């Protein structure tokens, strides 16, 4: 299996800052047959960003509709994405769950729509501080993974992300050991549900706070296969995070 | 007189090929954009493709905007980002967002505030249900919806209202132009009562119920109907006939 490092730009960017960033990213010589690197711009920046990135980079969108084509103002169907050859989607990011009411039922339906339309999916989950303090880390992640995991067909084409919500905006910091222990448990869930071969094929990314300070200690953990990176991916120095995985 | 305003709301429809074909048909209509506003609202990921293919006489916008600014809001498009892209218009409050995506009056207010702060023009939708109409509560519903945001309007050319007769959308019922006009007049009165007569007389109020080539003339001729936010009919080449009704 390949390392997978993803830039989640969230709701950030200008036309000119993207020109500069993409140029910086293009200057990194890496081997895309070894390493998957994926950039997730804002929807209205996707075309702009794709045209600026060399083919060694994959691209995707940050969210996708559970509905197909039709009378759904504001939504981008998986069918539309397919017609544009958008390669990846993010599903279940904690911000969609938090601010926009996204449920486990929505995650499932979105994954089903995406795979049906040959989109590859980066699917996010993870537990809160209150949950982790009640020793519910495994309970919660098990429940969240089992909402969708039976849909996975090609285990190269769904990528899991662990988001330690307990260490996001709480004042707590996840250690690499603590991230590793969770990732090993995620892998065990996949092994038990889908198989040994499948569990050894699937990528499980760390999607907590990732930056130039901590990327090395995380990426070298046995069951951490890369990152879904937030604000550090809006920087030229994101190339060093890519390097950590090379 | 108010400048008329004809908008294509493509909702979640389109392919690269369908958009080529449709935009080419639209471009075949000669009109003067200094006298008539004609706006297309493609899916976000189709905006660059559409904007490139449409001549400059057509304005363009997006079908939704975030209430948050730039930052850690996965999946959203901020008004700042739209401004940097020169996106001219946003749709806010479309009943499908209110129905399927839980958008509230507070969200509508906050989106409009963000949009105006970022020099976007806003097409803002509201309207009552079949039960509300049957219970003779149209005016009270619409009053509440408009007053959720109307005081934010900072320029009565740059915010455009849309009356969506939800009682005549997916219910089996068909609104008459007389019924639409009666509501439009009451909407304008709401604006007059809250913002002043001059401002009420400036604002475009569009009809956002079922519009097609056959009913458009009878609607747009009504005194307080200043144009349309068009659904399915805007996915057809014959949308140009709807534009011509406003010419
Ligand atoms: Ca290495
Ligand atoms: Na590793
Ligand atoms: Na009129």
Swiss-Prot record, chain A:
<keyword id="KW-0324">Glycolysis</keyword>
<dbReference type="GO" id="GO:0006094">
    <property type="term" value="P:gluconeogenesis"/>
</dbReference>
<dbReference type="GO" id="GO:0005829">
    <property type="term" value="C:cytosol"/>
</dbReference>
<dbReference type="InterPro" id="IPR000652">
    <property type="entry name" value="Triosephosphate_isomerase"/>
</dbReference>
<dbReference type="GO" id="GO:0046166">
    <property type="term" value="P:glyceraldehyde-3-phosphate biosynthetic process"/>
</dbReference>
<dbReference type="InterPro" id="IPR013785">
    <property type="entry name" value="Aldolase_TIM"/>
</dbReference>
<feature type="active site" description="Electrophile">
    <location>
        <position position="93"/>
    </location>
</feature>
<feature type="binding site">
    <location>
        <position position="8"/>
    </location>
    <ligand>
        <name>D-glyceraldehyde 3-phosphate</name>
    </ligand>
</feature>
<feature type="binding site">
    <location>
        <position position="169"/>
    </location>
    <ligand>
        <name>D-glyceraldehyde 3-phosphate</name>
    </ligand>
</feature>
<comment type="pathway">
    <text>Carbohydrate degradation; glycolysis; D-glyceraldehyde 3-phosphate from glycerone phosphate: step 1/1.</text>
</comment>
<comment type="similarity">
    <text>Belongs to the triosephosphate isomerase family.</text>
</comment>
<comment type="pathway">
    <text>Carbohydrate biosynthesis; gluconeogenesis.</text>
</comment>
<keyword id="KW-0413">Isomerase</keyword>
<dbReference type="InterPro" id="IPR035990">
    <property type="entry name" value="TIM_sf"/>
</dbReference>
<dbReference type="GO" id="GO:0019563">
    <property type="term" value="P:glycerol catabolic process"/>
</dbReference>
<comment type="subunit">
    <text>Homodimer.</text>
</comment>
<dbReference type="InterPro" id="IPR020861">
    <property type="entry name" value="Triosephosphate_isomerase_AS"/>
</dbReference>
<dbReference type="GO" id="GO:0042802">
    <property type="term" value="F:identical protein binding"/>
</dbReference>
<keyword id="KW-0312">Gluconeogenesis</keyword>
<feature type="binding site">
    <location>
        <position position="228"/>
    </location>
    <ligand>
        <name>D-glyceraldehyde 3-phosphate</name>
    </ligand>
</feature>
<comment type="function">
    <text>Catalyzes the interconversion of glyceraldehyde 3-phosphate and dihydroxyacetone phosphate in the glycolytic and gluconeogenic pathways.</text>
</comment>
<feature type="binding site">
    <location>
        <begin position="230"/>
        <end position="231"/>
    </location>
    <ligand>
        <name>D-glyceraldehyde 3-phosphate</name>
    </ligand>
</feature>
From Swiss-Prot, chain B:
<keyword id="KW-0312">Gluconeogenesis</keyword>
<dbReference type="GO" id="GO:0046166">
    <property type="term" value="P:glyceraldehyde-3-phosphate biosynthetic process"/>
</dbReference>
<dbReference type="InterPro" id="IPR020861">
    <property type="entry name" value="Triosephosphate_isomerase_AS"/>
</dbReference>
<dbReference type="Pfam" id="PF00121">
    <property type="entry name" value="TIM"/>
</dbReference>
<comment type="pathway">
    <text>Carbohydrate biosynthesis; gluconeogenesis.</text>
</comment>
<feature type="binding site">
    <location>
        <position position="11"/>
    </location>
    <ligand>
        <name>D-glyceraldehyde 3-phosphate</name>
    </ligand>
</feature>
<dbReference type="GO" id="GO:0006094">
    <property type="term" value="P:gluconeogenesis"/>
</dbReference>
<protein>
    <recommendedName>
        <fullName>Triosephosphate isomerase</fullName>
        <ecNumber>5.3.1.1</ecNumber>
    </recommendedName>
</protein>
<comment type="similarity">
    <text>Belongs to the triosephosphate isomerase family.</text>
</comment>
<feature type="binding site">
    <location>
        <position position="170"/>
    </location>
    <ligand>
        <name>D-glyceraldehyde 3-phosphate</name>
    </ligand>
</feature>
<feature type="binding site">
    <location>
        <begin position="231"/>
        <end position="232"/>
    </location>
    <ligand>
        <name>D-glyceraldehyde 3-phosphate</name>
    </ligand>
</feature>
<comment type="subunit">
    <text>Homodimer.</text>
</comment>
<comment type="pathway">
    <text>Carbohydrate degradation; glycolysis; D-glyceraldehyde 3-phosphate from glycerone phosphate: step 1/1.</text>
</comment>
<feature type="active site" description="Electrophile">
    <location>
        <position position="94"/>
    </location>
</feature>
<dbReference type="GO" id="GO:0019563">
    <property type="term" value="P:glycerol catabolic process"/>
</dbReference>
<feature type="binding site">
    <location>
        <position position="9"/>
    </location>
    <ligand>
        <name>D-glyceraldehyde 3-phosphate</name>
    </ligand>
</feature>
<keyword id="KW-0324">Glycolysis</keyword>
<dbReference type="InterPro" id="IPR035990">
    <property type="entry name" value="TIM_sf"/>
</dbReference>
<dbReference type="InterPro" id="IPR000652">
    <property type="entry name" value="Triosephosphate_isomerase"/>
</dbReference>
<feature type="binding site">
    <location>
        <position position="229"/>
    </location>
    <ligand>
        <name>D-glyceraldehyde 3-phosphate</name>
    </ligand>
</feature>
<keyword id="KW-0413">Isomerase</keyword>
<dbReference type="GO" id="GO:0005829">
    <property type="term" value="C:cytosol"/>
</dbReference>
């Amino acid at each position: 299996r390949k390392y997978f490092v993803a830039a989640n730009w969230k709701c950030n960017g200008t036309l000119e800052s993207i020109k500069s960033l993409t140029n910086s990213f293009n200057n990194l010589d890496f081997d895309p047959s070894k390493l998957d690197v994926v950039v997730f711009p804002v929807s209205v920046h996707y075309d702009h960003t794709r045209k600026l990135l060399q083919s060694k980079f994959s691209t995707g969108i940050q969210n996708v509709s559970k509905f197909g084509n039709g009378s759904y103002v504001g939504e981008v169907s998986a069918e539309i994405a397919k017609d544009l050859n958008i390669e990846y989607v993010i599903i279940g990011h904690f911000e969609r769950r938090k601010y926009f009411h996204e449920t486990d039922e929505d995650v499932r339906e979105k994954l089903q729509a995406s795979l049906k339309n040959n989109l590859k999916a980066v699917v996010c989950f993870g537990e809160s501080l209150e949950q982790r303090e009640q020793n519910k880390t495994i309970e919660v992640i098990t429940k969240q993974v089992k909402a969708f995991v039976d849909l996975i067909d090609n285990f190269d084409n769904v990528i899991l992300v662990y988001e330690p919500l307990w260490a996001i905006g709480t004042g707590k910091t996840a250690t690499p050991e603590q991230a590793q222990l969770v990732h090993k448990e995620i892998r065990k869930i996949v092994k038990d549900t889908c198989g040994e071969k499948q569990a050894n094929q699937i990528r499980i990314l760390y999607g907590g706070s990732v930056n130039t300070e901590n990327c090395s200690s995380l990426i070298q953990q046995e069951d951490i296969d890369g990152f879904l990176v937030g604000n550090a991916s809006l920087k030229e120095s994101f190339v060093d995070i890519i390097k950590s995985a090379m």
